[PDB]
């Protein structure tokens, strides 16, 4: 019977496999090859936050477009006034391995998580004023990745088991789990509408997940090493990966295949980090050279290079209003690009 | 235990097969439309005055 | 009342002294250009090599002047004040100069010898406290010459400036004190650092013989050059003091030893050469922060 | 705006009281030294933090008013390329090592060859404990199992000199040691500028001697860096 069943779970990959080329009308570039180039985005390190005193691994700004978090590898939260260069608090953490923070849309909690894999939840504008735990999450036997909050009283995380899960943060409770993947889980993007949410992973795969449901749908393989990195695009259709492979590629839901590759033969280091702009022409990446490459979305040119980090470029994010890049490095600084 | 894994595998494949599945050209030209469609309002694409530039 | 001589004075000591104006301006530029790099990394050396360079800049700004006084023939006089001001600094920036090299020895030799401990000894704000003290202390003790008329001279075709070869009581003690406490003091806690950091470096297992010969080359120079660019006038300075405190009246001592005190006071301003390449050109990492500049 | 000024003044307040507090966490974090301890199931990679001394177990020890704090990483799952470029800025990694059949020491070369010539282990110096030394000795002087069937290069050794005075001088034991030593330096002294070093030891289960051992090779490499900042080469 094992035999007869891995026949069948052949037969039915080449039938994938047939359909997906059969759908395969185009690629990205073929289309988006007359739109004029974006060029030379030469922007300055116009804020120089130093406050932290080892590597930033995450970084999360609220909804304000202001008060920002930022989490480092010494076991800082410090929460950060942009307008002022202000420090609003700075709130230690229990866990000095944090690999992502989160910062509350109503702005009155900040997660945070790590190799610990327990996400935690502070409470930020209490009536007292000063900041202190409210709860915890247990229940992943990986190192967390990524989790965001989902919209008030849920929250989405993801780590290294090959799966991701959703609390309620009233009660406490895993309330679905997410299962499918082979490899780590590295990051992890929401959909605006808060109904599906994807993921790559260390096995050159990535998958879509049904919030309301526990049912994978989707899955998409164009990769030869390790994916690292994820961000929504922010019509709520596609995404973006990179990989250890130096190569970083453009995936669609409905396409169900990849798209656009976006290489070079000089570049040998993986992409770390990838974020997008409010339009979505702009597509930020950080890399080991420790440079920013300004890709083009749609063209896969390095139209633009954010030189200034001495270290590897480990974080990425835009504001709510598009009004600045945050770059945190493992030279232990915060810079904001304008 | 093999036996239990091929048979999720093949399931899972067969829910994955017959998912509705859309040209890919259409995906690009919406992500292409959507890139396009707030140009104006990205102050990372288009300068910002220091007067309207909370960071200068 | 003491008859002089030489005729290559005219331009011998300014031989040495144009040489020195000539060479050392752009390396001590640059050495404080590296020492303020180094600073922006939070390393205290970047202080002690920036006071260096000033006080070498400052020397080597104010050497002219006394390049002419014996261009003419030991006779310059521009005014009292003008000379009194500039034969004071003249006159110490060197013990400034050597005072910032046994800083520096001193702060490599805590490193080195000791990389786990002194957390608050190396840190910038010690450093200009330290390097502030310094040049407070050096001004109040040579500021004793302020006090007195600098413009005596002998009778016989002569106007000095600052240095009366008769020369007068207090300047000859000012004169030992200047050799002892200035000339060996730091220069002897300067060779005492370097032979500490040889002794860690040859014990590292994580280093082969190729980098220790490199290492021990390196301080050889460094201990080396000084010596032979400050003893001599030293040694004469201190003959004349002796002989004159022994006995004033024999104007042949001076009038034999005129020769090897400027001939010697030309070779003094060699060190304003050596720091600069020494301490910032030749090193490798520094080489770098030279490409950088 | 009276309130205003008020505000920009409480603003100011709390930026002063933060910026004493990050002053103090500076100092803090300055000075103490993180390390990664490395091992394998059937060695003590474990025993020698407890000896010494879910998810991360962390400890905490001191040798000569030096703060040393290292982790365990053992919450995770048999893939460990990853998390392992955490550990990238501490002092040491701490490579434990299982020589007790040679069936696990190819896998042990493999391991410290990858850690070795990673893009963020080339400048830490590994140092290298060689655990489970008593069941090589114990077993390859036993028999019943050849090196060289294995690695066919055993036979063509002599006794290492001082490798461990042993009461008994077996030149197998000893060269089978420094056998595997250099089946590791095939890589650890082929490859590498001088960044890091190997720092080689042979400890069992039950040394003591760790700490100290660690504290000494830390100081090693902050001389060597000390070197390097204070433009002594």
């Excluded at chain 3, 330290?130 to 002998?154: I, K, Y």
Aim: charged share 25%; net charge neutral; hydrophobic share 40%.
């Amino acid at each position: 019977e094992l035999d007869q069943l891995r026949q069948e779970a052949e037969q039915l990959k080449n039938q994938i496999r047939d359909a997906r080329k059969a759908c395969a009308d185009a690629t990205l570039s073929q289309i988006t090859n007359n739109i004029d180039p974006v060029g030379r985005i030469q922007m300055r390190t116009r804020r120089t936050l130093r406050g932290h005193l080892a590597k930033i691994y995450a970084m999360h700004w609220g909804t304000d477009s202001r008060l920002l978090v930022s989490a480092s590898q010494d076991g800082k939260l410090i929460i950060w006034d942009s307008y002022t260069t202000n420090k609003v608090h700075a709130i230690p953490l229990r866990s000095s391995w944090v690999m992502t923070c989160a910062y509350a849309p109503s702005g009155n909690y900040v997660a945070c998580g790590g190799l610990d894999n327990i996400c935690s939840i502070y409470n930020l504008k209490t009536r007292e004023g000063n900041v202190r735990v409210s709860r915890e999450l247990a229940g992943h036997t990986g190192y967390l990745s990524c989790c965001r909050f989902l919209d008030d009283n849920q929250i989405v995380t993801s780590s290294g088991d090959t799966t991701c899960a959703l609390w309620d943060i009233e009660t406490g409770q895993q309330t679905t789990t997410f299962t499918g993947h082979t490899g780590d889980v590295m990051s992890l993007s929401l959909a605006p509408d808060t109904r599906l949410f994807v993921s790559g992973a260390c096995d050159a795969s990535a998958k879509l997940w049904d919030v309301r449901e526990g049912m994978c749908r989707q899955t998409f393989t164009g990769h030869e090493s390790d994916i690292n990195a994820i961000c929504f695009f922010p019509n709520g259709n596609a995404f973006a990966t990179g990989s250890d492979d130096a190569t970083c590629r453009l995936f669609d839901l409905r396409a169900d295949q990849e798209l656009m590759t976006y290489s070079h033969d000089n570049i040998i280091c993986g992409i770390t980090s990838v974020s997008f702009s409010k339009s979505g022409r702009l597509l930020l990446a950080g890399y080991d050279d420790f440079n920013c490459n300004v890709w083009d979305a749609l063209k896969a040119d390095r139209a633009g290079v954010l030189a200034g980090h001495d270290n590897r470029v480990s974080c990425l994010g835009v504001t709510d209003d598009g009004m600045a890049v945050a770059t945190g490095s493992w030279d232990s600084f915060l810079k904001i690009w304008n | 235990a093999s036996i239990a894994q091929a048979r999720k595998l093949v399931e899972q494949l067969k829910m994955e097969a017959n998912i509705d599945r859309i040209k890919v050209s259409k995906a690009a030209a919406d992500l292409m439309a959507y890139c396009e469609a707030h140009a104006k309002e990205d102050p990372l694409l288009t300068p910002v005055p220091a007067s309207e530039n909370p960071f200068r | 009342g003491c008859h002089v001589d030489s005729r290559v004075d005219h331009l011998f000591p300014p031989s040495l002294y144009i040489f020195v104006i000539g060479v050392g301006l752009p390396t001590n530029c640059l050495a404080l250009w590296a020492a303020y790099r180094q600073v922006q990394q939070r390393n205290e050396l970047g202080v002690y090599l920036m006071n260096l360079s000033i006080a070498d800049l400052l020397y080597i700004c104010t050497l002219p002047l006394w390049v002419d006084y014996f261009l003419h023939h030991d006779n310059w006089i521009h005014g009292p004040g003008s000379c009194k001001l500039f034969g004071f600094i003249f006159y110490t920036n060197i013990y400034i100069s050597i005072a910032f090299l046994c800083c520096i020895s001193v702060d490599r030799y805590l490193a080195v010898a000791h990389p786990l401990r002194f957390a608050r000894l190396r840190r910038v704000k010690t450093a200009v406290a330290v390097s502030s003290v310094v040049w407070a202390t050096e001004l109040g003790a040579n500021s004793a010459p302020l006090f007195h008329d600098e413009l005596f001279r002998d009778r016989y075709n002569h106007t000095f400036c600052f240095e009366k070869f008769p020369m007068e009581g207090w300047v000859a003690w000012m004169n030992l004190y200047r050799v002892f406490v200035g000339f060996l003091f730091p220069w002897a806690l300067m060779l005492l650092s370097y032979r500490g950091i040889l002794r860690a470096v040859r014990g590292s297992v994580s280093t082969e013989r190729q980098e220790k010969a490199k290492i021990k080359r390196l301080a050889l120079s460094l201990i080396a050059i000084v010596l032979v660019c400050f003893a001599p006038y030293h040694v004469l300075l201190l003959s004349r003091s002796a002989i004159y405190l022994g006995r004033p009246w024999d104007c042949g001592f001076e009038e034999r030893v005129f020769s090897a005190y400027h001939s010697s006071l030309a070779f003094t301003s060699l060190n304003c050469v050596a720091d600069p390449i020494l301490y910032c050109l030749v090193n490798e990492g520094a080489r770098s922060d030279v490409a950088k500049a | 705006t009276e309130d205003q000024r008020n505000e920009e003044k409480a603003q100011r307040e709390a930026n002063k009281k933060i910026e004493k507090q990050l002053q103090k966490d500076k100092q803090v974090y300055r000075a103490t030294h993180r390390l990664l301890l490395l091992g394998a199931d059937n060695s003590g990679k474990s025993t020698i933090v407890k000896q010494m001394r879910s998810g991360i177990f962390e400890t905490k020890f001191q040798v000569d008013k030096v703060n040393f704090h290292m982790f365990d990483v053992g919450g995770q799952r048999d893939e460990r390329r990853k998390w392992i470029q955490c550990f990238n800025d501490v002092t040491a990694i701490i490579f434990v090592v299982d020589s007790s059949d040679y069936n696990r020491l190819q896998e042990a070369l493999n391991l410290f060859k990858s850690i070795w010539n990673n893009r963020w282990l080339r400048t830490i110096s590994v140092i290298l404990f060689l655990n489970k030394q008593d069941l090589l000795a114990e077993k390859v002087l036993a028999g019943k199992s050849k090196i060289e069937d294995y690695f066919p290069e055993f036979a063509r050794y002599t006794t290492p000199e001082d490798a461990t005075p042993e009461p008994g001088e077996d030149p197998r034991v000893t060269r089978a040691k420094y056998f595997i030593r250099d089946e590791f330096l095939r890589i650890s002294t082929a490859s590498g500028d001088g960044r890091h070093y190997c720092y080689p030891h042979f400890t069992c289960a039950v040394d003591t001697e760790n700490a100290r051992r660690i504290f000494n090779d830390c100081k090693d490499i902050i001389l060597q860096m000390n070197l390097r900042e204070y433009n002594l080469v």
